[PDB]
Design a protein around this ligand. Sequence first.
Ligand SMILES: [Br-]
Ligand SMILES: [K+]
Length: 731
Amino acid sequence: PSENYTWKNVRIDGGGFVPGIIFNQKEADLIYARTDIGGAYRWNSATSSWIPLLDWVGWDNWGWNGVMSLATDAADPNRVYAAVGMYTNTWDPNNGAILRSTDRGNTWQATPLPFKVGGNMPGRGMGERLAIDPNRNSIIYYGAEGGNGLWRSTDYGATWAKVSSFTNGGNYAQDPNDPNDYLNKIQGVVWVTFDPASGSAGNTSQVIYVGVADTQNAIYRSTDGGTTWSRLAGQPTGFLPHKGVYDAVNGVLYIAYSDTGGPYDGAKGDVWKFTASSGTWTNISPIPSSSSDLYFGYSGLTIDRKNPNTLMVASQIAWWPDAVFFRSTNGGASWTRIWDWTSYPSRSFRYTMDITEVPWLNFGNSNPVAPEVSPKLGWMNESVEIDPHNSNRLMYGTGATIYATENLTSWDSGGQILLKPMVKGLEETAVLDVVSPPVGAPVYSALGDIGGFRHDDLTKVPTSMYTTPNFSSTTSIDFAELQPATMVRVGNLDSGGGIGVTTNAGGSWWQGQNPPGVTSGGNVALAADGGAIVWAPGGSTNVYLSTTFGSTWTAISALPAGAVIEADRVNPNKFYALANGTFYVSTNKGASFSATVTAGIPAAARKFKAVYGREGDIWLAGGSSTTTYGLWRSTNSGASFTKLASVQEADNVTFGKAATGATYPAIYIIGKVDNVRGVFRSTNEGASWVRINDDQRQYGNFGEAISGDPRIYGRLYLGTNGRGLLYGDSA
Ligand SMILES: [Br-]
Ligand SMILES: [K+]
């Protein structure tokens, strides 16, 4: 069946990598943003927020939430195309696609490709691979990876095929010898850039420039509308062209090169200028690769279209002490930098930064040691863009946000530019766990890359992620049912992993001690009275008990490393564990566990949860298409589980306030019911289900972490991997 729900994000703002920002060259305020795991977005100037465009990508085609390239038609701003697909190795089972739209991405249609697209692979900051002919807008090019070369549509992206006369598919990969089959892919044909003066409106553009990931053959050009391609004579060698921007006002192509494909590295590179009339090449690097003070390559190349003597470029990459941006107002003859050393470790800045609207961007340390500042300018800044309709507006992506200025030309007269986050409505975190206790804040998130937050108000960005300790990624989080001010979380640190505890609901946390061998946070369970923690850290060879609230640890024999630990929500003495088709139980508050079920539950299942208010009531969700699948329930403290016949597949389960006059909590699952994939709620102990999402609101590979709300009927906290933390309410 099907009920009318309202779906919103819990307000965080950004939180991920934005490898591409794209301004429409014709229409002011038409801006798009592509992400590597969280789909695409379009700016809404009237709300000052981004609108997501790919939430209809669902469970079977989840990889289409990786957005490798995006082009917005200068000759028809209603048209927009996206190249999608997430991995070019086996992590993504499906090929990519070119999506096409005629209403700015409210609706789309897909043309699948015969190969994979690497929206979350190395090389993804390089772009744009998609390019529409600015004079004959039926023609679209796409530079492909994996050795597939350059691809072209002549009918608005309906059919695609290989341009066979473009023979150089590229040979660079970050590391040909990677055992893990991830760094070793051909990054391929990396951008396409047209010369608008080479045709007239309605007629094929004759001059086309192509960037290839081949250090000895980086740049190609056609001069007959893509019938034949030549290596561009006189060109430099040794490097990778991240970005190629043509200026037809002066007849010049600017390229930025790095020694790696990005986005996380780059130690060397150059910026060059190719003059079309004469065929002459000039090195215009702020700092050339011939200097050995240079410790980055170059990306974030952007030209001021209202004044194309103005242009910028940025470091790819400078981690330390921060990124560097550069500006020339004279076609690269000379440059100025956005900061400068005075006397080490002090620096002068041509910018100020205001993060009042996203205060957690200081990472819970306002005053790190010089030369570092907080918040930082940025990192992984592959996209930097001057607004083609306004020379005072720039925007760039980082690993965690988008920053924007409205007074860019303040730089030119000696002043300081003002930079502020511009990510409202763009919600890109991977949610790793979540809980909704029955008093205090409504929900606490445990996120990848930026920690996690107590969320006092769902409409308000929180002040800071968790601190003392401050995980880069909080992997697991629990509260004591009977005493929910008592909580624990675990997660990752530079030094491996860690644990944090509290007895005033996060008011102050302190870090406990580790057991031996911890490489990552893994998962954790808190007894119902707060009187024992059981913790399956990652890397560590055992699961461990603390009776001293994080001060000391004892191995538990019987349990494999990395088993899923959950506690009974009523009985402090009962803990439960799941690993590879065996369920285990303790009745002595953690000290020891025994296997109770070794058959009839599927080997791939790894989500189960005990029900608040009900001793020994456990639901369990998991499996695979190639084995068995569904939802199971024990009411006997894990001695036996029954399969629910109402469900064909489930991947996670949780509970929240019962319907009015029902005797049991509502149960929410991620799953398949009566041949329909989605999110489902049962208000009758699982006898029937109602779908609470719909086909426009699927969120790809979602559901790793979900939680009901014990105070609020019909509410699900729904976790995603790329689209932040959602809440759904019934209408
Ligand atoms: Br660095
Ligand atoms: K570097």
